[PDB]
Amino acid sequence: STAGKVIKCKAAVLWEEKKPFSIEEVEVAPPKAHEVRIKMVATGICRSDDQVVSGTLVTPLPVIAGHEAAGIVESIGEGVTTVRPGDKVIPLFTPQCGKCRVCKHPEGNFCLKNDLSMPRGTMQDGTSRFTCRGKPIHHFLGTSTFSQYTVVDEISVAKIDAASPLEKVCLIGCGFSTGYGSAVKVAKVTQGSTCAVFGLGGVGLSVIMGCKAAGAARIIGVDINKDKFAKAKEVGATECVNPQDYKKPIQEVLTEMSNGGVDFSFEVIGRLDTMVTALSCCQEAYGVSVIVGVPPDSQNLSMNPMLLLSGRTWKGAIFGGFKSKDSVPKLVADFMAKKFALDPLITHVLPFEKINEGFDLLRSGESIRTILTF
Amino acid sequence: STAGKVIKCKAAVLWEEKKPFSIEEVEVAPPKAHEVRIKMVATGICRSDDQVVSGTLVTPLPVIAGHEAAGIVESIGEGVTTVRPGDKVIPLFTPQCGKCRVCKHPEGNFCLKNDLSMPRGTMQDGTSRFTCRGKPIHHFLGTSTFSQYTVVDEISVAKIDAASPLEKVCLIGCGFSTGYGSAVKVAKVTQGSTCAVFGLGGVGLSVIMGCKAAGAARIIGVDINKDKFAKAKEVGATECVNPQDYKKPIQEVLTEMSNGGVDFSFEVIGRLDTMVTALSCCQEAYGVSVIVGVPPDSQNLSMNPMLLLSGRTWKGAIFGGFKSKDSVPKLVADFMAKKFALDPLITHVLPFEKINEGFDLLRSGESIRTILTF
Numbered sequence: 001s002t003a004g005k006v007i008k009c010k011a012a013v014l015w016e017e018k019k020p021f022s023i024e025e026v027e028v029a030p031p032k033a034h035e036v037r038i039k040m041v042a043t044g045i046c047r048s049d050d051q052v053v054s055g056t057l058v059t060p061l062p063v064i065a066g067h068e069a070a071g072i073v074e075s076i077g078e079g080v081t082t083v084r085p086g087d088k089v090i091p092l093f094t095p096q097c098g099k100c101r102v103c104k105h106p107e108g109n110f111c112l113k114n115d116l117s118m119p120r121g122t123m124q125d126g127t128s129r130f131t132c133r134g135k136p137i138h139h140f141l142g143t144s145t146f147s148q149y150t151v152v153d154e155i156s157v158a159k160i161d162a163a164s165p166l167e168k169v170c171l172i173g174c175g176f177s178t179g180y181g182s183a184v185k186v187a188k189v190t191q192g193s194t195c196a197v198f199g200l201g202g203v204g205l206s207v208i209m210g211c212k213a214a215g216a217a218r219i220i221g222v223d224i225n226k227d228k229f230a231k232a233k234e235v236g237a238t239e240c241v242n243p244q245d246y247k248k249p250i251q252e253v254l255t256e257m258s259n260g261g262v263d264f265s266f267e268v269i270g271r272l273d274t275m276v277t278a279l280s281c282c283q284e285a286y287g288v289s290v291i292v293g294v295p296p297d298s299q300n301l302s303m304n305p306m307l308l309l310s311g312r313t314w315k316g317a318i319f320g321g322f323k324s325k326d327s328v329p330k331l332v333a334d335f336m337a338k339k340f341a342l343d344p345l346i347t348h349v350l351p352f353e354k355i356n357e358g359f360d361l362l363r364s365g366e367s368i369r370t371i372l373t374f
Numbered sequence: 375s376t377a378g379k380v381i382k383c384k385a386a387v388l389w390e391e392k393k394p395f396s397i398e399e400v401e402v403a404p405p406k407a408h409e410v411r412i413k414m415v416a417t418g419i420c421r422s423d424d425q426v427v428s429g430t431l432v433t434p435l436p437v438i439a440g441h442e443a444a445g446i447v448e449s450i451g452e453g454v455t456t457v458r459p460g461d462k463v464i465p466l467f468t469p470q471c472g473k474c475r476v477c478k479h480p481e482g483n484f485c486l487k488n489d490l491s492m493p494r495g496t497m498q499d500g501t502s503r504f505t506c507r508g509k510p511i512h513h514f515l516g517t518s519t520f521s522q523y524t525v526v527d528e529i530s531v532a533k534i535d536a537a538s539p540l541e542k543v544c545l546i547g548c549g550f551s552t553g554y555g556s557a558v559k560v561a562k563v564t565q566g567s568t569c570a571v572f573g574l575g576g577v578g579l580s581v582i583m584g585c586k587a588a589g590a591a592r593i594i595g596v597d598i599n600k601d602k603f604a605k606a607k608e609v610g611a612t613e614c615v616n617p618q619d620y621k622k623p624i625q626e627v628l629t630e631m632s633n634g635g636v637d638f639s640f641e642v643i644g645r646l647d648t649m650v651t652a653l654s655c656c657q658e659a660y661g662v663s664v665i666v667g668v669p670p671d672s673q674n675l676s677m678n679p680m681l682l683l684s685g686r687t688w689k690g691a692i693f694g695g696f697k698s699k700d701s702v703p704k705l706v707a708d709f710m711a712k713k714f715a716l717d718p719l720i721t722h723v724l725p726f727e728k729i730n731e732g733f734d735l736l737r738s739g740e741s742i743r744t745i746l747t748f
């Protein structure tokens with residue numbers, strides 16, 4: 001009987017850029033019409049949550065960040081039909097309203113109700129469900145998973161299998177689905193192709209998993225941190241290259257290695273220069289390059305459009321191109337059926353209260369995904 | 375007989391940038407092994423030829439330019455198997471060797487034997503068949519059609535229907551096939567879609583023809599020259615807009631007109647600014663933008679990669695993505711079977727001796743295609 005009552009609980013509040021999270025008591029309002037309040041069970045530390053701290057991914061502060069998570073419904077607002085109290089759920093940082101021109105399109109997933117293109121840090125109704133020290137606190141991407149309890153819009157949550165291990169399937173809420181979908185859905189990697197993956201973190205390892213699932217013959221991992229190469233090979237890389245080892249730019253190295261350019265390249269870092277390098281290294285007539293990394297706010301890249309004129313395709317995607325609410329329950333079902341592995345992504349486990357230690361592990365280069373448990 | 379002998383004939387020589395063509399006698403050597411000497415019958419004036427004069431498309435000078443043409447085989451070198459003397463032919467500025475990794479790929483057409491990516495201005499053997507006033511003269515894109523006679527490599531020529539009208543089907547050598555293919559093969563325009571076409575010259579009108587053939591519901595022509603709008607509507611534009619008429623940038627105008635962005639946009643001008651505008655005006659989640667225009671030499675554009683991260687596809691192509699030697703005869707057969715029209719592209723038909731007057735018509739905005747007749 002917390003239904004319809006304010007809940008006091010602990011959250012990780014970010015008051016200022018480039019500062020530690022503050023673990024402290026917040027007030028979580030009850031859900032309004034078509035809103036869902038979730039008791040969080042596990043949440044991943046994604047580089048995009050660090051980009052909020054760095055100020056390179058801009059969203060209003062102060063904020064409760066976190067977007068890669070799983071929990072159990074505590075209560076539903078009036079009119080909710082797609083979840084019930086006690087259901088296991090994954091918050092959807094890319095919503096699926098099911099009504100807009102994008103949700104109706106066979107290949108769109110970037111639903112027009114998203115809080116990604118022009119972040120306001122609110123619920124759909126333009127208000128916050130979070131108070132801290134008597135001050136309103138922003139939401140993040142309509143999810144805000146660094147909290148014992150959050151409130152999300154119904155279009156931002158999916159019901160998943162009741163037997164789901166939530167400390168694993170939280171990765172379906174971001175890094176696994178993003179990287180796997182970038183390969184199998186956005187690029188549509190083909191059997192016997194040569195792929196180059198720039199960045200061997202949680203999301204780039206998931207791209208490798210998707211390239212290997214699609215039957216690529218060669219998967220070249222690219223990272224400046226050679227410590228990332230062993231796990232990249234475990235999940236399917238056939239060879240790994242560190243740009244720092246070479247006198248020549250890595251686009252020239254990769255073009256040589258692939259006897260004239262790769263079939264598919266993926267930027268999975270978030271840098272302007274590696275976005276251009278990744279486009280250049282794909283074959284000039286028929287190559288495809290996919291941007292997955294989140295570039296720094298309000299910065300333009302410079303490129304030569306002759307790279308496109310010869311025949312290259314350049315595209316990007318959020319969340320692996322998956323329509324979120326249709327896709328997340330299916331991805332969980334496929335995980336339960338052993339169609340892909342999540343354990344290779346999980347290098348560390350900590351209690352939520354050690355969230356700062358989890359960010360330090362990511363920043364040091366030591367972790368892939370740290371999973372925090374509430 | 376001319377076979378096996380040097381031919382002295384008339385050609386339009388470009389001795390240096392930003393000067394008129396010089397119409398004078400050149401010597402055309404006989405074809406070597408796997409080469410074809412063609413008597414030219416008609417050639418079109420394409421903006422790319424003007425870009426060589428402007429210096430914004432770089433190729434070695436002095437040069438015989440011209441790449442959009444048709445003629446009749448005068449003689450064949452040893453080892454030629456695909457054409458014979460007397461055949462009607464179209465030179466292929468994009469070759470099709472049939473042997474390279476691109477020619478073997480189902481979606482590639484930018485054959486590695488091309489003289490487009492690093493223009494040398496020669497035959498495949500690295501020599502020139504042209505002299506003028508005792509100086510060697512460069513080839514252009516392996517074609518050089520501003521000459522009563524040219525010599526091309528076999529991989530740079532297609533045999534066409536003996537009954538085809540060369541004064542019309544010369545456009546299948548560049549402008550028609552480029553525009554049409556950019557719509558139907560590269561973009562793969564869908565039935566009921568909304569398309570935006572930037573530039574309503576010969577290639578942009580051919581893009582409109584392809585979008586209409588593909589069943590687009592709306593085709594928005596964009597040009598700063600409103601005199602181009604009447605013919606754009608004749609061949610299928612549903613509306614035309616002049617950016618100079620608006621206070622707001624045209625990407626904003628086209629996003630509003632299309633209720634959130636177009637399905638397909640095409641840059642058919644060759645400006646960096648319009649390439650970015652065209653990408654921006656396509657819907658952010660599922661839009662596709664195709665670069666057809668040839669951008670100015672050695673100049674980079676600046677763009678915000680978030681345009682791609684939301685889901686846009688950005689791609690370019692040469693010659694409408696068509697594998698040139700397979701496609702050109704089929705396009706001529708389809709023209710003979712009334713599957714498309716070429717007359718709407720032809721505004722002027724001049725003798726070859728009036729080449730300079732033909733270029734002045736293009737530069738002044740008066741013409742679409744001028745066809746020069748030998």
Ligand SMILES: NC(=O)c1ccc[n+]([C@@H]2O[C@H](COP(=O)([O-])OP(=O)([O-])OC[C@H]3O[C@@H](n4cnc5c(N)[nH+]cnc54)[C@H](O)[C@@H]3O)[C@@H](O)[C@H]2O)c1
Nearest residue numbers: 047048178199201202203223224225269270293294318319
């Ligand atoms: N498109 C989406 O929906 C989506 C989802 C999830 C993450 N992201 C972004 O994807 C990117 C990767 O996220 P992640 O895997 O969690 O991050 P991560 O774990 O930091 O991995 C990035 C990897 O890139 C490596 N790296 C850094 N700089 C360079 C360089 N200059 N050259 C070659 N390698 C380099 C780095 O060593 C690290 O292993 C970040 O930009 C995220 O913000 C996008």
Ligand SMILES: NC(=O)c1ccc[n+]([C@@H]2O[C@H](COP(=O)([O-])OP(=O)([O-])OC[C@H]3O[C@@H](n4cnc5c(N)[nH+]cnc54)[C@H](O)[C@@H]3O)[C@@H](O)[C@H]2O)c1
Nearest residue numbers: 421422552573575576577597598599643644667668692693
């Ligand atoms: N990709 C290929 O294989 C290929 C083949 C043929 C042509 N080209 C290029 O395609 C482009 C078009 O060729 P074309 O149709 O012969 O040329 P064109 O006949 O000069 O047509 C270009 C049109 O662009 C219009 N225009 C110029 N500036 C602007 C502007 N700022 N805003 C809006 N409209 C503008 C201009 O008024 C004209 O009607 C040129 O860049 C060619 O070099 C590429």
Ligand SMILES: CCCCCCCCCC(=O)O
Nearest residue numbers: 306309310420422490491668
């Ligand atoms: C990517 C290299 C492109 C070179 C294009 C040379 C001109 C092709 C013919 C044309 O555009 O009319």
Ligand SMILES: CCCCCCCCCC(=O)O
Nearest residue numbers: 046048116117294680683684
């Ligand atoms: C198209 C603008 C999107 C920028 C923000 C993307 C953040 C989503 C979460 C993630 O990347 O891990």
Ligand SMILES: [Zn+2]
Nearest residue numbers: 097100103111
């Ligand atoms: Zn929607």
Ligand SMILES: [Zn+2]
Nearest residue numbers: 046048174175
């Ligand atoms: Zn993420």
Ligand SMILES: [Zn+2]
Nearest residue numbers: 471474477485
């Ligand atoms: Zn070839």
Ligand SMILES: [Zn+2]
Nearest residue numbers: 420422548549
């Ligand atoms: Zn041309």
